[PDB]
Amino acid sequence: SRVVFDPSNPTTFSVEAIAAYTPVALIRLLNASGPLQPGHRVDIADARSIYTVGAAASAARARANHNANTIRRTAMFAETDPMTWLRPTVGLKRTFNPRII
Amino acid sequence: SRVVFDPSNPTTFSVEAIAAYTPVALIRLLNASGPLQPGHRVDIADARSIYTVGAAASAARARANHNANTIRRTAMFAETDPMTWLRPTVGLKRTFNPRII
Amino acid sequence: LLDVEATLVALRQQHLDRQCYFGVYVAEGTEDTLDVQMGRFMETWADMMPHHPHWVNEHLTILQFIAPSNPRLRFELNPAFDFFVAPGDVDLPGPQRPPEAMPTVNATLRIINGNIPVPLCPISFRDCRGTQLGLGRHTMTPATIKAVKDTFEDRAYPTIFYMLEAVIHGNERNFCALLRLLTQCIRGYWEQSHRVAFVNNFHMLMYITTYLGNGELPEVCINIYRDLLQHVRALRQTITDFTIQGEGHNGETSEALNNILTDDTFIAPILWDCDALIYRDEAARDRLPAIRVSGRNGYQALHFVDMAGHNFQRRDNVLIHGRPVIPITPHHDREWGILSKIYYYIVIPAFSRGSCCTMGVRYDRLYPALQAVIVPEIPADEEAPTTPEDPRHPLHAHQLVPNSLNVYFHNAHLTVDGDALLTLQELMGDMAERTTAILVSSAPDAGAATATTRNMRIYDGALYHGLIMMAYQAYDETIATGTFFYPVPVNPLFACPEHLASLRGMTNARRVLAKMVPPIPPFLGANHHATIRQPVAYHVTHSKSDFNTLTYSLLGGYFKFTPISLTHQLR
Amino acid sequence: SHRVAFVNNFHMLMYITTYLGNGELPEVCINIYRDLLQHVRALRQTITDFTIQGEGHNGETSEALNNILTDDTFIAPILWDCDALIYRDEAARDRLP
């Protein structure tokens, strides 16, 4: 489990399983008392970066859940087309709403 | 009971039991005649301050009743967090309504 | 005009003693990030100032400057040179601490005719020359003037804009993806106080005009942006108009032979992509160039950086944000650099009036803060709420938890939907490691390059992935001071006597010391060796005529003083 | 009545500009407050502009040696916190207080 007290506990392996809102609520209730005996001698700010990439994974999970109704996005620039010889290509301004039905 | 006529009667012990609106109605209907024989030789203005802390306790009771639907308040300033090392901390502007449902 | 060898010899013959070599010494970087070097420079520049500088007292009138009590009078000999004293037998740049040596006389070159001291060239004459330049050229409307003035003078600018601009770092693949959030936030900020946002970065308003230029925004903000762009273009056109065309030497042609705003050897104060460095190294190719990027000489450009491997701690590595459409290639065209220089060196100083500053960011602290999104799940076959009064809205108290992004947005008092906040996950594709410093140096131009001036060298510093703050306020307790930014100003113009309060370990002594002299670290450039010097800063901070006239006067002052540029100007 | 309020205390309009400076109020009252603050800052800048900088004696700086509004020995007529007393006792430290 993710226990920020013992620095060896929190890792991106468990953060992905956790939801998006609960970790914020989780970190909120945890006390300031952190055991100084365990500690990453490996630039603990990497565990910070580990916390970042874990939060990105949790956000990616919530985004995939929201994508059930979202419209598939396309390229917003030109020059990106398999066969441009048939007809030209243009981008698209993302000024829509993902709601479908 | 709380009888402001005899100054030894009114005390914060009984004001807590009294509600918030009734003491205002209580004081209004009492007559001006105060028996001069009983009296606090202990700076009667302390009984005035005793009347204040009693009213503050009565108001505290009314808020606890009102707190059934209100939202829990948080810190409005920064630098107040158990583990600021993970992520920064910001305050909150109390510009909401306590109505929930 | 350039036979100063005998004069320098004669000056060195006579005995003169002097101290306080602060504004004449240049150093290098010890590969720290920014902060250790900043603190070391603070302590040194504090305890290494025996006397007061002589280039800082530019308030004297012509009478006082001529009076025989003036100490810097004997060194005012040539109008195109600057004679100062510096520790001899040292090489520039050198070590971090200046070694003790015997002081000798050295003479640099006044590249700009505006670098003449104010006691010799007054401000009224400059304003009159500017109003003679701007006879019937394009001007700005009082509405736009008032709007941009209020935006520059406002101290309630939300830090969410700084955070958004920092995480965008000026890339089209980011702008076009976040276009949904940006229009909403801009309209929301505007229809609360009648103020236009995102005026810090140059690579924001052209993107605005190009993408949101069809009626997405109201007819007022787009008009203000168009007016600003038109003013910049009119300035550039005037630079073209006031020179003769049809001649070019081994280096660049008439344009940068005459002016500096059209020069490629000169660089903007803020760098987002490495195309300017390519243009710089490919333009001159004659004057011996040198680049110091945090230690080793020579920069290493690479493509976009993934999310997994970011490596916040690095050395000698610069990004280009990938490509929108293997060797590196310039991102934009050439005149983009000219427009950026014109903007940053004319319109920003004319409006800020020495109030803005430049700072560095901390992505290692910023990124973990932006990864807290509490957008709620939308029910199937349902619609999303637009107003924040219902609990379903992301901006509701039911979904407002401390230490998140929604509390940031509420404190800013904005209204956003869910997909805009979700686009941040796609923004997380590209990354920004850190902001860094660049020290470039080159010989004088071939217009004045003679057998002795080639030994002289100019030094100027610039920031990569930096930031420009308009008005810093230390009275905001909602966010700790120095949570994401730290001042690192290197300019006599972009100096900030008040933004230093955000730096850790600041005392009243250091504050009053920096209140007089502009704090600039020696590894970022010295005043007597840089191009922009104290006279222009004093002029822009003490002149009170107008905004259009001030811009045109600054443009007129931004001209070269070479015997070749004179052949253009006199003609 | 088209009137601004809370002008008696100096520790009210600063708080107003710092907190209610996003658009909570109409664009008129916040503009009035910003104009007042700008006038105060302009006077402060004028004081510095009308003196020569770069010299200081055993006491305060040139600013306080020339003018009084920039002096710490002087005190405001109304005090809400005791930081002014700390600043006053710390600034002079020479004249017998």
Which amino acid, one-letter code, is at D20?
Answer: L
Q: Please report the beta strands in C43-93, taking only residues with DSSP state E, as ranges in sequence order.
A: 81-87
Q: Determine, for residues B81 and C403 on separate chains, whether the beta-carbon distance falls below 8 Å.
A: yes
For an interface test with C, which of A29, A48, A73, A76 has the most C Cβ atoms less than 10 Å from its Cβ? A76
- Residues of C within 8 A of B76 (CB-CB) are 478
- Name C85's bridge partners: C105
Tokens representing C479?
A: 């966010």
How many other C-beta atoms lie within 10 A of the C-beta of residue C276? 24
Tokens representing D56?
A: 């200081």
Cα C223-C225-C231 angle, rounded to 5 deg:
100
Cα C99-C104-C108 angle, rounded to 5 deg:
100
Angle between helices C142-153 and C221-241 (to 10 degrees): 100
Phi and psi of C94, rounded to 5°?
-135, -145
Q: Determine, for residues A27 and B85 on separate chains, whether the beta-carbon distance falls below 8 Å.
A: no
Q: Where are the alpha helices (DSSP H) in C259-312?
A: 275-283
What is the least distance, in Å, from the CA of C118 to any CA of chain B?
Answer: 46
Q: Do chains A and D touch (3 or more CB pairs under 8 A)?
A: no
CA distance C552 to C133: 7
Order across the sheet with C485-487: list the strands.
C467-469, C357-361, C485-487
Listed resolution, Å: 3.7
What is the least distance, in Å, from the CA of C167 to any CA of chain D?
Answer: 23
Name the helix (H) or strand (E) containing D46: helix D29-49
Look at the block and give the residue holding tokens 């003078």: C153
Three-state SS string over C448-516 comes to: CCCCCCCCCCEEEEEEECCEEECCCCCCCCCCCCCCCEEECCCCCCCCCCCHHHHCCCCCHHHHHHHHH
C453 contacts C444 by C-beta, under 8 angstroms: yes
CA distance C168 to C426: 12
D53 interfacial to chain C (CB closer than 8 Å): yes
Q: Determine, for residues C413 and D18 on separate chains, whether the beta-carbon distance falls below 8 Å.
A: no
Count Cβ neighbours within 10 Å for each residue of A14-47 and write b for 16 or more, e otherwise. Answer: ebeebebbebbeebeeeeeebeeeeeeeeeebeb
Cβ-nearest to A30 among B82, B85, B87: B82
For an interface test with C, which of D22, D46, D47 has the most C Cβ atoms less than 10 Å from its Cβ? D22
Cβ-nearest to A56 among C176, C183, C307: C307
What is the least distance, in Å, from the CA of A22 to any CA of chain B?
Answer: 16
C30 contacts C127 by C-beta, under 8 angstroms: no
C290 contacts C440 by C-beta, under 8 angstroms: yes
Tokens representing C18?
A: 């002097």
Phi and psi of C225, rounded to 5°?
-60, -45
CA distance C429 to D19: 35
C532 contacts C461 by C-beta, under 8 angstroms: no
Q: What is the DSSP string of C352-399?
A: HSS--EEEEE-HHHHHHHH----PPPPPTT-----STTSTTSTTSGGG
Burial class (CB in 10 A: 0-12, 13-18, 19+), C56: middle
Cβ partners under 8 Å of residue B62, min gap 6: B19, B20
Name the helix (H) or strand (E) containing B45: helix B45-66
C166 contacts C361 by C-beta, under 8 angstroms: yes
Distances in Å between the Cα of C46 and the Cα atoms of C335, C498, C513 are 41, 17, 8
Burial class (CB in 10 A: 0-12, 13-18, 19+), D78: exposed
Within 13 A of C465's CA, how many CA atoms are on the CB side?
23
- Going by the DSSP 8-state scheme, the letter that residue C212 receives in this structure is S
Residue C493 CA from chain centroid, whole number: 9
What is the least distance, in Å, from the CA of A66 to any CA of chain C?
Answer: 7
- Residues of B within 8 A of A15 (CB-CB) are none
DSSP-derived 3-state class of residue C543: coil
Tokens representing B15?
A: 């004001």
Cα A72-A75-A76 angle, rounded to 5 deg:
115
Closest CA to C196 of C170, C162, C159, C223: C223
- Residues of D within 8 A of C52 (CB-CB) are 54
Closest CA to C194 of C235, C160, C148: C148
With the CA atoms of C461, C465, C469 and C473 taken in that order, what torsion angle do they form, in degrees rounded to the nearest 10?
-110
Cis link prior to C93 (omega < 30° from 0)? Answer: yes
CA distance C472 to C351: 16
A5 contacts A35 by C-beta, under 8 angstroms: yes
A6 contacts A36 by C-beta, under 8 angstroms: no
Experimental method: cryo-EM
CA distance D52 to D63: 9
CA distance C555 to D57: 41
Angle between helices C534-542 and C123-133 (to 10 degrees): 80
CA distance C344 to C356: 11
Q: Determine, for residues C403 and A93 on separate chains, whether the beta-carbon distance falls below 8 Å.
A: no
C193 interfacial to chain D (CB closer than 8 Å): yes
